[PDB]
């Protein structure tokens, strides 16, 4: 049997690069998506063509609500249903937008999305992963800039901080079960869709190492390392993949 | 006119000590509470006996829900209606219990993330929007990177509060509102905890082998709101007697 | 009687502001200086005119060498000789200059000054202070809020300030059983270099979120005063940033 | 031809594991040593037998003296001499012993600050000066924020090494030289009952890290899979640093 992995928000961008690279390493993959139905199915088709029966999709809103636990349970369940095991969880899915403290989503909704996807869903997915339980491991996508945050991004920042706390707490608690829990913290990687090219180059020029953003593959590379046999004593660790960005003063 | 302060969970223990010290410092105080009505009123009466019309109480549940934003807006409002201004917010209220990975889970999330993180954020928003030496102090936790076993949601909330501290410091600094934290290690231990178990914690503290008094925590809060902290924002002061420096 | 404090590099700038504030709080002070003799004696004079017999000077190079331990021992001894006690040590003295990796002091000299003043002398003074102990004893170390986002080409300075964090933690742990607290104060941008030009100063000022200005020497001293006070009696191993939010600002 | 690595203190324990793994990965390697000539040569023998003329040794004392600079220049040199290039520097060599606040102190400084911090800084300068996937890996310590009682100078030096890692990453990024750290917890350990005490504290498997586990992290950091990673310190501690008092 090949080991199996769940990757959240795996339809596009970094999650996709992680799913692809896990697959290329021998994993069967559950491709979680929320809205990117077409891109999801397209990836699974591409992976299944490469080796049949090695990729499924699973749809779920990771917004906080009273039913998020059941949705997270379902994501993990889908991996056992498809593949009879679940060896790796990658908590990649993420909402990211400004929530200024000083003044068309309600604040209730902003909290639900930013805290639910970035922190609560990871926690619930971790809980379901552990409960349904080898080289078992969880990788959380954190954020190298969490201590030098973007202005007006307090809820996102709060969620990413909470994710660091989850990384530590679950590493401690799940170690006796042989499950390792680690983090990968991008600096600037795949830049947003609705962002101009002056503004892209603004960000690029701040990166000491090469004056450019991370490829999604460069982020995936770190994920690969942490799940691998080369990381069997690593737990509770967060690896920044930021080209020095977090070292740069204002 | 005397400045005013809101202290959440102010009825008992650390928040009580904070409210009293701010009062003794010359502040008028909103004593926020959840269940502890009798304790909150009795504190208010004592402070008002010391100085007339300087203390009011305000009831609210800080658990995460669709109505928490309204609740927090009202807390801040209560300070303005009582005293005509709101100079200081102390985010002290906290839920703290284990949530093992292996009450419903939704309730646990709502209580531990709502009280520890989301309500502070909502209160911070309301405080800033309704605007001197304005400042916010959040009660953090010195042991957040060396957490208690099976306290993941608690720890996530306290980490989130560190993020809020930093993020709000950055964003509110142009308005002249400072935002800082106080991170106790072991302070007031549960009353009902056995002395032999309290002693296990006490013995771990390098500095004097005892827990912090509530007054010692309040002392750091007083500093951060004071004119001696006018350039300090986005700082978290550990008040932990060296406990976080101690290896396993 | 009145408590006594040693403040290193106290002739000018932040060290002076710390000595002054400790003095105004009722402390007797040793003003340590290296080169700034005129300025040291002037300050002691001012303080002595305010209350007599309350300020002494003490000269010492804090560059690392085989005699640095003796020099640090002597600084501490100066306090016991003048005032009969030593309650507070402020490690303020600091060398600060670029040491580029890829490149007229020798490298030997750079290491001795930047690592000596910023880390080894604090460690030796800490040892001497604690050993001489026979109340509210504490040590405050002047750290740097920007140690994790350092200036380009300042590796030795940054290494010494990182060592000083390590000293702060290690000494807080070890000395707590003796009742000695050890904490730090970490400025961001405070008094800018005397040599720096106004346009350069203003570039730095505009980076500070809280007020777009540097900390005053007094504002730094305020935090020192808090940590030595009875208001900080349970605080040890803490480093308080006094930086106006500067360390939170991304590139 | 094939890339070349320097590993300091590579004769035994953690440094040897790093040396072997880099060799296995296809690096030509300099095995630096202070005292352990026998061990160094023996390792050299083993690696040359697998692949001819791909491992040399280098003597240098890394204590803090007026000659440390020259020593560190020599070490980097010997890599360019043997192999005509130097792709990777692993700063592994390290001293470790208590220095209570309550050997002359300056030997202590020269060892604990000298070997642990100043020589890395000097080797970094020489490595950089003489310049691809170039990078430097510094052996840090995961327990730096919760230090052993009475280990102030040691702790100070390891904190200084974090400072160097960050400052050098920033400064050398323009030249395509990455600079990173690996922070072991309890690895190869002292009595046997004392050692057991430590093992039981570790969340992940109640045992010390093998030297090879440390070396694995180094390998990752030098590899093409880490081409965007600089200024990062990877803990390899089995979760020990997460455990409270
Ligand atoms: N990109 C960067 O430069 C950096 C990224 N990171 C972190 O790395 C990770 C990957 O980054 P990146 O690829 O840019 O992320 P994206 O912003 O592209 O988001 C990843 C996926 O998250 C999913 N998602 C969003 N909201 C929800 C929701 N309510 N329910 C379920 N899924 C949801 C989306 O799925 P769908 O499309 O199917 O709706 C989306 O495609 C994230 O955790 C991010 O925070 C860290 C810092 C830098
Ligand atoms: N004591 C210690 O050793 C430590 C404390 N801290 C932090 O210090 C701060 C003060 O500590 P401490 O006094 O021990 O705190 P407590 O655990 O005693 O709680 C403080 C107050 O929080 C309020 N609270 C709890 N749940 C809710 C809720 N759902 N809605 C509204 N209010 C609620 C309660 O108000 P009411 O009684 O009126 O219902 C309670 O009196 C906290 O933020 C805590 O996490 C951090 C480290 C250790
Ligand atoms: N100023 C700022 O913006 C910032 C300051 N800091 C820290 O705050 C503290 C105070 O800063 P600031 O007042 O600007 O410090 P200065 O740069 O003005 O230096 C203070 C004193 O250090 C002494 N000193 C320098 N080299 C030696 C030596 N070899 N032997 C003995 N004494 C020596 C000098 O004494 P003398 O004049 O007698 O020769 C000098 O007056 C320092 O530790 C500094 O690193 C941190 C970050 C920002
Ligand atoms: N082992 C552990 O549990 C821990 C490891 N680490 C770090 O991992 C690395 C490896 O640790 P470990 O293998 O135990 O190291 P050791 O303490 O065993 O020493 C490593 C090597 O350093 C060399 N060395 C020591 N002093 C000098 C000197 N003055 N001049 C030149 N060379 C010198 C020696 O080479 P030679 O034999 O030729 O003299 C020695 O074999 C170190 O950086 C250490 O701090 C971090 C925390 C804990
Ligand atoms: N889900 C996402 N999280 C983050 C976090 C940070 C960034 C980022 O740095 N974008 C460039 C401004 C972009 C994203 S996308
Ligand atoms: N709102 C609160 N937050 C906190 C955070 C930490 C502590 C604390 O340190 N309590 C004592 C130590 C301790 C550790 C572990 C457990 Cl099960 C328990 Cl009942 C108590 C106590 C509280 S109360
Ligand atoms: N002993 C001293 N230590 C420090 C540490 C930091 C600073 C400081 O922040 N100075 C202003 C920033 C700065 C940045 C770059 C350069 Cl060339 C210079 Cl002359 C100064 C100044 C000093 S002085």
Numbering used by the authors:
A (entry chain D): 2 to 104, 113 to 142, 152 to 268
B (entry chain B): 2 to 103, 114 to 142, 152 to 268
C (entry chain A): 2 to 104, 113 to 143, 152 to 268
D (entry chain C): 2 to 103, 114 to 142, 152 to 209, 213 to 268
Q: What do the study authors state?
A:
Therefore, to evaluate the possibility of targeting subpocket C, we tested four-atom-long linkers, as present in the amide-based scaffold of 1a. For 1a, in the top-ranked pose from docking simulations, one halogen bond forms, together with the expected hydrogen bonding pattern of 2-aminobenzothiazole. However, the tail of 1a occupies subpocket D in the second-best pose, suggesting that such a binding mode is also possible. However, the other three compounds crystallized with TbPTR1, sharing a para-halogen (either a chlorine in 1a and 2c or a bromine in 2e), have the amide linker in the cis-configuration with the phenyl moiety occupying subpocket D at the entrance of the catalytic cavity. Notably, one of the top two predicted binding modes of 1a is consistent with the crystallographically resolved binding mode in TbPTR1 (compare Figures d and a), with the exception of the orientation of the amide bond (which, however, does not directly interact with the receptor and probably depends on the water network that cannot be fully reproduced in classical docking simulations). Furthermore, the positioning of the 3,4-dichlorophenyl tail of 1a in subpocket D of TbPTR1 is likely due to the fact that the para-Cl of the phenyl tail does not sterically fit in subpocket C with the 1a linker (while meta-chlorinated or brominated compounds, 2b and 2d, respectively, fit). Finally, comparison among the compounds suggests that the presence of the para-halogen moiety (as in 2c, 2e, and 1a) prevents binding inside subpocket C, consistent with the QM predictions (SI), suggesting that para-halogens are less favorable than meta in subpocket C. In some subunits of some structures, parts of the ligand tails are missing, whereas the 2-aminobenzothiazole cores are present (in TbPTR1 complexes with 1a and 2e, SI). 1a is the best T. brucei inhibitor, showing an EC50 of 3.1 μM and a selectivity index toward human THP-1 cells over 16.
